[PDB]
Amino acid sequence: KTSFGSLKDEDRIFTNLYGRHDWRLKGAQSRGDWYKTKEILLKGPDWILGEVKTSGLRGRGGAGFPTGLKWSFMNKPSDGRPKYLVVNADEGEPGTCKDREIIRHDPHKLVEGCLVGGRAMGARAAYIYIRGEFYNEASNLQVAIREAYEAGLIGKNACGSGYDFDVFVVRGAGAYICGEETALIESIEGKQGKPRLKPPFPADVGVFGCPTTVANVETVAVSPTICRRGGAWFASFGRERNSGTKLFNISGHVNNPCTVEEEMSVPLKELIEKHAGGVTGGWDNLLAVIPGGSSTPLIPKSVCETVLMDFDALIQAQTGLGTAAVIVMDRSTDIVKAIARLIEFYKHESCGQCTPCREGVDWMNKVMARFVRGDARPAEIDSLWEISKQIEGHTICALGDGAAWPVQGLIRHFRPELEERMQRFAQQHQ
């Protein structure tokens, strides 16, 4: 198969995404949730790991690491310490709101995914680190957790299989840096949300020093569907190493901003034209598209015509897939102002532990503010580029790369715009 997109409603995993049906236990049980879970629990961790590594499912958090291998390093015999699965439900990234709808509208899918994942690695309990601002979603998840506890699906003798598993909900306190897995692990333990250094990986030393696997909501909620329908069913979509379905949040300067599931290798132009209703002012009014939120660099209209929205066709397009969050800017937008706002967001969300981010993100914010005001010279611009090259790869966590990438993308794609802005400032005020 070579033509992707136009996903049929039968193959969509996330039914009741829009909340038109019941989100509680009885509504979810009539859609396919909690069905033959005890058979999977009896088949066990080797079968679950094989079925999730046959599908080719990667990490939907934004790094794209293979889920089978990542859940496979944790499978090892015990050394006296318990094992834990932790679900990253933070989404501090701008443009991304898919897991909010997953938690609010399909919480039992998340709980069943937690149970299947904890069976895969032999985890003792599950910790769900929801965002601090998401009070209603946390309460909905707690209601669904109590409803599953009442029916005997989890807790004592989970689903009639003899396995012990628990689920906990830990609210955040409004931090983007807590979305990072090691910083999330530290913030669970009651400390400041500052990321650790790998090694040690969380599979060896994680939360409370126990073995730990941190997985996204989107890659956890699809695990029972993978283990039930089959790995080849999930692998039948998309390209090779690009298998499955993906949730896209299209927003910005579009007619109908929305969250919609789609085939993993759908073209960007087809997705924008079909689901979002088109760019404001037509397709010819396009200026720039950010494919995966503020971490991923922007791409102009010249590349957006013939691009595919998977991992490989976007890393080859000098950008990244990220969280698959589409931000659309048309011709009536100041790109430098948008990038300056993104850098201001990155400097307002920075843990300040390690030196290069702590100094260089503020430096980039000041330089970008001077760029927006135009009070700068062209010779500074490449210097700003070098500043990004002194941040990427020299930081503890990947917020430094996620802050250096938009500046590099904006410079590389719109150096003439910046040069025109500063020369207009020079010829006007001087």
Binding site: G174, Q192, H275, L342
Partner: protein, 213 residues
């Protein structure tokens, strides 16, 4: 935005603070949610619980939380200063937060901002004279397809225009509680031009289950 504390008669270590007995039971449940030997994790929820006692954190809840969990108070100070959702100053009853990140900036969140500023007669980070509102500016809050959006207390008011946020402010001043939802025609996340996807009824259990399971 000062990260150091100066002793004032309003905010002193001798400020009266103590949890209610029902909050003591809730704190005990929070502590029992965590493994033994790692009680310090309970610093994160319980301190937030203290905020729900007052709406803000004087330096008497931090010392009390440090005392009931056997942790030094400087760790509680670190926790209260690292995160932005803990109020170390007395905020108003209705704390309004406006998201001005780029997916919300493209859909004119600054229009909402100047409408609120014109209506309430205050600026960003300023409290109303009757202590009913407090307007600040925050980063992204994870509802970017519903841009522009604001958050009041723990409720989300999304997809607003200036008229809707004016109506929300007049409803808050009257004492009623508005519905925490988008003010447009759509409900949660569907496109405004009709449901493009998920129009089929759900298949139900037993569909697509492979053999040998």
């Amino acid at each position: 935005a000062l990260f150091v504390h100066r002793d004032t008669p309003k905010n002193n270590p001798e400020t009266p603070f103590d949890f209610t007995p029902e909050n003591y039971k809730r704190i005990e449940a929070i502590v029992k949610n965590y493994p033994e030997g790692h009680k310090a994790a309970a610093v994160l929820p319980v301190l937030d619980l203290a905020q729900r006692q007052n709406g803000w954190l004087p330096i008497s809840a931090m010392n009390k939380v440090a005392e009931i969990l056997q942790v030094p108070p400087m760790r509680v100070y670190e926790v209260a200063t690292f995160y932005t959702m803990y109020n170390r100053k007395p905020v108003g009853k209705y704390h309004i937060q406006v998201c001005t990140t780029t997916p919300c900036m493209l859909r004119n969140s600054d229009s909402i901002l100047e409408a609120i500023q014109k209506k309430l007669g205050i600026k960003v980070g300023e409290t109303t004279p009757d202590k009913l509102f407090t307007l600040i500016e925050v980063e992204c809050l994870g509802a970017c397809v519903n841009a522009p959006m604001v958050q009041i207390n723990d409720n989300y008011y999304e997809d607003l225009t200036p008229k809707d946020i004016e109506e929300i402010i007049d409803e808050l001043k009257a004492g009623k509680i508005p519905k925490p939802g988008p003010r447009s025609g759509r409900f949660s996340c569907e496109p405004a031009g009709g449901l493009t996807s998920l129009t089929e009824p759900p298949k139900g259990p037993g569909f697509g289950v492979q053999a040998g399971l």
